[PDB]
Amino acid sequence: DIYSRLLKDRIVLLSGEINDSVASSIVAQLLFLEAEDPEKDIGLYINSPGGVITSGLSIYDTMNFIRPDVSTICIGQAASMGAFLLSCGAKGKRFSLPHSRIMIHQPLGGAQGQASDIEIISNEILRLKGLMNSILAQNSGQSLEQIAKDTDRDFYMSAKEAKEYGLIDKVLQ
């Protein structure tokens, strides 16, 4: 296949809706590249609308677990969990193409059942909300209060604004 020849050039392509199945593939690819040259950089191209929070975190944690540096490039769009993973790229090596779109926002979820269970779930989504916004704050330099404000409802920005914002280091041309 074509994707397996790029995996030969240290390239990984994260495209589409993120979920446990997809994250397992991204992860496995990173672990695989860990096996190979553990000092060579990796080029993780991202074109995603977002996905399962925990699934995305498995990719985030793996990026920071392997020794190789993980450069992230935004092509097409990076929204929600994708904007998140894009911002987690190796410092200075987080990019985007000129026309991409970057959008961040708060977690989405659901709960049904007894009042007690709804509160349990509500607390967890709130916790995940706090965790994510926290990492986005670290990543971009923005403050906690500022991220919480901007992520309240969908926050769309161009590649340039994404840079000015601190989510992306450079915009290629």
Partner: peptide, 4 residues
């Protein structure tokens, strides 16, 4: 569930 929980989506970001």
């Amino acid at each position: 569930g929980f989506t970001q």
